[PDB]
Amino acid sequence: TTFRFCRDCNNMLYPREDKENNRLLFECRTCSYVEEAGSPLVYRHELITNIGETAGVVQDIGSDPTLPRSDRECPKCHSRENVFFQSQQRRKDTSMVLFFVCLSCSHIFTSDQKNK
Amino acid sequence: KGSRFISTLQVKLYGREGSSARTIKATLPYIKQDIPIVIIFRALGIIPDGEILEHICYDVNDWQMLEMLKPCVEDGFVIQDRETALDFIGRRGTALGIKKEKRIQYAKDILQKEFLPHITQLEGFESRKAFFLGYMINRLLLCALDRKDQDDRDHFGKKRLDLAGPLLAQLFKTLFKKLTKDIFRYMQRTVEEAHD
Amino acid sequence: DLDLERSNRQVWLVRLPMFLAEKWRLGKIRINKSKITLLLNEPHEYDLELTKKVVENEYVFTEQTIPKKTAIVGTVCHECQVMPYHKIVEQRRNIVKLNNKE
Amino acid sequence: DESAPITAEDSWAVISAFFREKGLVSQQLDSFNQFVDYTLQDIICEDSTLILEQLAQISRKYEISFGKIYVT
Amino acid sequence: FIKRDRMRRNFLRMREYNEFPLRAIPKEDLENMRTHLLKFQSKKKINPVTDFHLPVRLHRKRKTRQLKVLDENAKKLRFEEFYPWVMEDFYNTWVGSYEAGNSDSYVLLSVEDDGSFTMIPADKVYKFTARNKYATLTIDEAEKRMDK
Amino acid sequence: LEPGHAADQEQAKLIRSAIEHTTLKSVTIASEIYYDPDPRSTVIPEDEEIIQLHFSQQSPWLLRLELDRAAMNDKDLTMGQVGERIKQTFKNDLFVIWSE
Amino acid sequence: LPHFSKDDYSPESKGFVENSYLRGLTPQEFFFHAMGGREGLIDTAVKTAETGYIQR
Amino acid sequence: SLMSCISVGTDPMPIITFLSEWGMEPLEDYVPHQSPDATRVFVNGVWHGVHRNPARLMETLRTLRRKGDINPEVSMIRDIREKELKIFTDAGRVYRPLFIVEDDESLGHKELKVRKGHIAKLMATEYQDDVEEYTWSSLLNEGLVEYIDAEEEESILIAMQPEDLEPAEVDPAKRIRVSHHATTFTHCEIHPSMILGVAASIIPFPDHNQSPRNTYQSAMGKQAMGVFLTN
Amino acid sequence: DGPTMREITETIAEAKKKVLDVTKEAQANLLTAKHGMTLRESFEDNVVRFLNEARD
Numbered sequence A: 001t002t003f004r005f006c007r008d009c010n011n012m013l014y015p016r017e018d019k020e021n022n023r024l025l026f027e028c029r030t031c032s033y034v035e036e037a038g039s040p041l042v043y044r045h046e047l048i049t050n051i052g053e054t055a056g057v058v059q060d061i062g063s064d065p066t067l068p069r070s071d072r073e074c075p076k077c078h079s080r081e082n083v084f085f086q087s088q089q090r091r092k093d094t095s096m097v098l099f100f101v102c103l104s105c106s107h108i109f110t111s112d113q114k115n116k
Numbered sequence B: 001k002g003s004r005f006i007s008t009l010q011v012k013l014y015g016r017e018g019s020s021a022r023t024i025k026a027t028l029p030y031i032k033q034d035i036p037i038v039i040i041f042r043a044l045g046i047i048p049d050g051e052i053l054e055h056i057c058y059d060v061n062d063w064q065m066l067e068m069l070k071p072c073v074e075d076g077f078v079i080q081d082r083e084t085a086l087d088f089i090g091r092r093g094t095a096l097g098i099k100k101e102k103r104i105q106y107a108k109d110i111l112q113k114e115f116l117p118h119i120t121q122l123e124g125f126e127s128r129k130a131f132f133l134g135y136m137i138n139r140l141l142l143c144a145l146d147r148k149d150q151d152d153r154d155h156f157g158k159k160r161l162d163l164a165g166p167l168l169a170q171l172f173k174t175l176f177k178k179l180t181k182d183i184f185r186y187m188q189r190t191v192e193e194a195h196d
Numbered sequence C: 001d002l003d004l005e006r007s008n009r010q011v012w013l014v015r016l017p018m019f020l021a022e023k024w025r026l027g028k029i030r031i032n033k034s035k036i037t038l039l040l041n042e043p044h045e046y047d048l049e050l051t052k053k054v055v056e057n058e059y060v061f062t063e064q065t066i067p068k069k070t071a072i073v074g075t076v077c078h079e080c081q082v083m084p085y086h087k088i089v090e091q092r093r094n095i096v097k098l099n100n101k102e
Numbered sequence D: 001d002e003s004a005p006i007t008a009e010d011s012w013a014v015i016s017a018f019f020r021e022k023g024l025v026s027q028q029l030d031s032f033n034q035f036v037d038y039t040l041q042d043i044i045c046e047d048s049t050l051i052l053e054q055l056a057q058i059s060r061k062y063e064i065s066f067g068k069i070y071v072t
Numbered sequence E: 001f002i003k004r005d006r007m008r009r010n011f012l013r014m015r016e017y018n019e020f021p022l023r024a025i026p027k028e029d030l031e032n033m034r035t036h037l038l039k040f041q042s043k044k045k046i047n048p049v050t051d052f053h054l055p056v057r058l059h060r061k062r063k064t065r066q067l068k069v070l071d072e073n074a075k076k077l078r079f080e081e082f083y084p085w086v087m088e089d090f091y092n093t094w095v096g097s098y099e100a101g102n103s104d105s106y107v108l109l110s111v112e113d114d115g116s117f118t119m120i121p122a123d124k125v126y127k128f129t130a131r132n133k134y135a136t137l138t139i140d141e142a143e144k145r146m147d148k
Numbered sequence F: 001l002e003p004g005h006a007a008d009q010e011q012a013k014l015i016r017s018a019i020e021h022t023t024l025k026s027v028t029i030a031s032e033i034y035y036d037p038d039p040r041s042t043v044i045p046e047d048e049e050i051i052q053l054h055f056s057q058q059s060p061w062l063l064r065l066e067l068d069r070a071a072m073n074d075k076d077l078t079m080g081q082v083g084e085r086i087k088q089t090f091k092n093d094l095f096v097i098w099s100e
Numbered sequence G: 001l002p003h004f005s006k007d008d009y010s011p012e013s014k015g016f017v018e019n020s021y022l023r024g025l026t027p028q029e030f031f032f033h034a035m036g037g038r039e040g041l042i043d044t045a046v047k048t049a050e051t052g053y054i055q056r
Numbered sequence H: 001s002l003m004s005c006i007s008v009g010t011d012p013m014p015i016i017t018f019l020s021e022w023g024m025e026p027l028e029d030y031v032p033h034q035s036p037d038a039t040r041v042f043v044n045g046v047w048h049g050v051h052r053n054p055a056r057l058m059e060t061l062r063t064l065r066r067k068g069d070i071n072p073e074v075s076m077i078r079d080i081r082e083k084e085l086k087i088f089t090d091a092g093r094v095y096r097p098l099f100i101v102e103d104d105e106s107l108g109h110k111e112l113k114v115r116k117g118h119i120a121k122l123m124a125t126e127y128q129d130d131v132e133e134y135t136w137s138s139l140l141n142e143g144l145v146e147y148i149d150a151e152e153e154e155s156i157l158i159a160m161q162p163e164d165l166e167p168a169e170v171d172p173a174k175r176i177r178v179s180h181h182a183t184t185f186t187h188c189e190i191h192p193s194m195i196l197g198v199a200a201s202i203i204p205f206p207d208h209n210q211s212p213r214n215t216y217q218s219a220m221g222k223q224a225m226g227v228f229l230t231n
Numbered sequence I: 001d002g003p004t005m006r007e008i009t010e011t012i013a014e015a016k017k018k019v020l021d022v023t024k025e026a027q028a029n030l031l032t033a034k035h036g037m038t039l040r041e042s043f044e045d046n047v048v049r050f051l052n053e054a055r056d
């Protein structure tokens, strides 16, 4: 995660192990620029995800006519005008929880009960 | 406007899910293989992958997508040069035009004329075609990441109906070439023999 | 043989509509503070747009393994877009969709 | 009043207008009409010319143009 | 419950600042001078060739009768220069590239010795890119390496 | 099921688990690779509390991965097997510790 | 159908014709019913071609 | 169907040229970092630029098409969530007309832009058979009825019939309908029965039939026997 | 007759309730996809079950 690019080379910095100072540096297999490892974690794989559950929530989601309105009150705004929609993770196993969006604070909440 | 061309780009993603070597290649016309994308960008002149990636992932936060792109970035690593890139492609299709200096050139011309013959066929637009080939790629990734559903082929929005206008056009157009060709031939052969 | 003459002029790029483009193939920069305006020679008082203030790595150059007579004139100081006054403009810009062939 | 919202019956006046104007075979006619007006001409003028040059000791060259088009 | 075609009865029986003049600039200059544009695409905050090197060099680097294709001049011209514009030392480097996206709607008002401007539309616009900053290549071996 | 063991859900559950194919990638959440150089001390806080916990040669790249409970507790499993499974998988070149 | 808002799983949204042939179908029901009815025609066409080949 | 028509296609150039001078920055100057929130803009599937305030852009083109300067064949779709704005002037698209609902009112709620006034102006013209010539076209140019293709249809919310659905808030023999719970209608259907083609427009009460039965008759009626032409 | 049509109307209306409930339970993520089908499928079968029991 969090790729790093070079400068004056701009390619992406692979990690090159420093054993002597004994830490991780990021090389640049084209121009020899280097720097540290801002964190020893290198790679993630992320089988079961929980992102895209709010894909493209723009400040205009309130301006889309086709989205179903709903009346519940935002925990923050305590306003009762909010559009909502299922989780945008277009995949089969996906749950059927609801993401609301208050038209006032643009705060996102959920209809959940298992985990908020 | 002219011949209603039928060039058909494709961006094939390789290796099933779960496999590695999930690399991405595209199939330009008249190129007997399919070229890794990071090349094609460089051929258009986007060298620093950090850019190439920015033609594809218009949201730098999204690191999933980048991860899917890295095995492509590393596949192009051997090449960092536009003309090599251009040269690389030129090697790979209808090698009759042996002129080496003109080899890369002809590759440089296949991009310009034969590659997305819509958005344009003039000279000097590869910045445009570059973004498009990015877009085409990005949409590919949304699907392999399940961020979008697969495409729907029966959606009537994507159909078209050729009525008598078009159908005559397609027909008449070819019948008009044939008329020229013959005129030209006669025009030639009469001049060939200076006939009246 | 190329010559970096001075390359320090604060050239200001302007994007304009076609009716403007045709008219350009005098001025009166009546800037005001940052609501920058300008008077055009007659025509209208079309203001400048701070379309892009900062413009780096962008320079003007002219010319006259073949070489040629290069001259680097000026640098982009800021990019502008035309502000069309709008009465006739929209009256014709909307009417830009009022032409065809026979 | 002439701004009361219309009622479901009123549609059929709108529909009459549509057909009183568009007929039922409009698309058959409209497309063909378009083809005859424009697409014909533009087919001609996309390749309006074809050339031929012969080289001498000065090179003779010939080329033939295609202009307006007329349909009786 | 019926269809009433007699409704045509009722409907029949119901109805400071710096102002600057700009003039017909000489053309013969323009008849030989062409004023293009240029952009460096290295992000290098300023990247003026003032600091590039010296000297700077901007330049580019039998049968019977037959019928040929037909094409307008400009494209015939534009095509017939496939030598790009370059800058070098004798070793930092840049390479040019036609842009063509916005070659038209750009007239220029360069701050001359005075604040005024002669009137100048841009001829063309070029995208200038660096090169050989790390100067590595296996132009021949690339195929060999990419096929191991 | 076995003739005596007809309608004993429990006994059935054991068989269902006995044959149902289970790969790792069905129980695990995500895999991370670090560069935590010391074999003994780990930059991650918890791994220390278990490094000694079983320390009481090896590469500096920690590969660590995380499983769901409810997944791992659906066709329920004990990491004691899971580990030794890995242990039995490659070799004992791949040192492995797992959480309790 | 473009007459519904998004993410609408109510019975009448996903195709539950509620009236009876006596009462008549509302325009959506009509269209959902016609969509189900077409699928019946295609099967019949298929089921007789594939039957015919089997039996021979 | 009866109402459906089919585009003949126009020239996209005016739109593009218009788009340029209304904020669409060309592609060559696009840098996704600085414009994280711009909207791509397509014209016949050609990416042409991005725009930073597309909401104002959309409603400009619409009225520009409801005025009648963008030829009403032209389809323009704003796909808010995908940050895209697509426009087709392509030929061959299939489209049908619809009433425009303007959620504007002194009545304080939404309602069709077409009122008894225009209806009268229409029936006046049919029974012409003194000229004010209210035709179909006038309904177009006055922004009362729009053509809608099948792609654009994705982004509207159609009402089924005006009355039963616009005003906010029973015979048991009457069929059972559902409500106007949707409060954001942007169009209304002219008549729901216009979804039928020619052959099926002759079945009486086709909504009391089993569906295949309507397919049969719609194919038999073509081999009925009548008068085929008066001559 | 009238009395009957009322009960049919009620009997239909209960189904909508039973469907509504399952919708809410599903949207509160309170459901239990019986092993061998994701939450989606479990949700569907239930619905179609009620909607078919209702007609019958």
Ligand SMILES: [Zn+2]
Binding pocket: A006, A007, A008, A009, A010, A011, A028, A030, A031, A032, A033
């Ligand atoms: Zn570097």
Ligand SMILES: [Zn+2]
Binding pocket: A073, A074, A075, A076, A077, A078, A079, A102, A103, A104, A105, A106, A107
């Ligand atoms: Zn809120």
